[PDB]
Amino acid sequence: VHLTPEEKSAVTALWGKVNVDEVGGEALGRLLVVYPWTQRFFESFGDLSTPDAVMGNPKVKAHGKKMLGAFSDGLAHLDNLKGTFATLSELHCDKLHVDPENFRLLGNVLVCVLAHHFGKEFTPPVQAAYQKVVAGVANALAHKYH
């Protein structure tokens, strides 16, 4: 949607400190652990039997990195999230049929991961800015449903 300059400031400053090789795997991993029906979409991924197995599964890590790549792209195109996520929308909606509530769930997991990694720095206004971002990404990813 429309972030204020203060919110854009909050988002971009934090994001520059994010380890993009790790945070994606961490968020995808927690998604599969916390909301286990999501493992349904990852049957080829091998061992997902325990939280430790999920988090250390190299395919989970690799795929989380790709997923976070798309978030980063969204961050650079906040005023055109629909266009940025058009092909991913077709993929997640028309091909995979993932219910869009799971997009909201992953966004909130990402928020929890950022909170966990950044602690006090992840202030309530910073979180509010991120909640606008993940809401916008989930909405754009679900466009093929609307």
Next chain:
Amino acid sequence: VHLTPEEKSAVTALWGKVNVDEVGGEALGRLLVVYPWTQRFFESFGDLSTPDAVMGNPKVKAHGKKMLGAFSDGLAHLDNLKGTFATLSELHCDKLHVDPENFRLLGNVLVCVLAHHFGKEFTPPVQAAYQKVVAGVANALAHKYH
């Protein structure tokens, strides 16, 4: 969104038989009875203490008629639901702060009311067409949130 010609046919044919002075009140009334937190937005409406009181409350009936008026407008503008519902969106989102899940709930209640009134005529393909319509209306009404 995009209804097929068959779906547009299903919707418009049924709708021509709808009593627009009654179905709105019936749907708003059931919304307040089935999901009672929604009564929070209708404190000025007087007696809402029982299902009979709700359904026979003339303000519920009057307001349901206005609500259904907006649905009818949406039916005539399916390929521009966003524009049609722009002012209602500002009202329901920015002024009233109704959570958009309640738009989905009212749509589904309307579906139940149509099923109840039309019986066998409300076939599964007819319902599917209506589910696209109420989804589109809820999404357009919630645009100010996105």
Next chain:
Amino acid sequence: VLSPADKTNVKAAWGKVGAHAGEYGAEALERMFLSFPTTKTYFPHFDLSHGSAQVKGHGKKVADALTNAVAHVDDMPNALSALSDLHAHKLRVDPVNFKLLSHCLLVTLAAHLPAEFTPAVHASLDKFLASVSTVLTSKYR
């Protein structure tokens, strides 16, 4: 939390439905598949076309589970335990999907019960199906 009036309402609706229950279960399933196409992916091995013997057979199973819940309404978690294990552990059914089938079950009842589908009974049925859904999504791990 189902009230005494809710139980009476749900029992009365079940009574009127009568031996149509399995047929109505199949109709609710069909309505879900057409209205909410994402749900179709849980049945990749079913033919979901109109008149499918597999959907008819499954509708009967769904109906039988719901009536078992009605018959044991004051202890649904126990009655539906094996079914909740199945839907969560083996099938991995997205919890959102229970609201969709529950809505279709209501629409089916409404389309077949003109006298009984009053606002009060509608409310009672929604609570019952919500209660069944709560149990069916209670076993994720």
Next chain:
Amino acid sequence: VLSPADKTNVKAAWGKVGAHAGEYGAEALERMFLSFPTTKTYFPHFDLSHGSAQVKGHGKKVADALTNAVAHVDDMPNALSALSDLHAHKLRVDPVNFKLLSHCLLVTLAAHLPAEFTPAVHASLDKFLASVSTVLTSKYR
């Protein structure tokens, strides 16, 4: 359905939080108000600005309810009965709103518990808060 591991996990998290619980409750409330502005309408008579004495006081109430739930985890419906009556009957709180506060409570814990907020404990805490929310939305009528 909370497992024995879930209860141990939730108890351990409560233990580390310690006497910060009320302060954390207030922070979760503030996070909800800023992230999810629709929730603000339930508190028209509160000042919701940063540092508000009313939000601090309410955070303590929220924390005390949650710890009462932890202390009586095997009978949450009984422990939270009066609170569920209040939120449903008097306040008419939209059930969606419980997921929003529950998320903010998690974020607050995560921002304050670096060692404890493991994926396993995160899962256990989400189930606990979902269980508390199920009870708190169990009394609509």
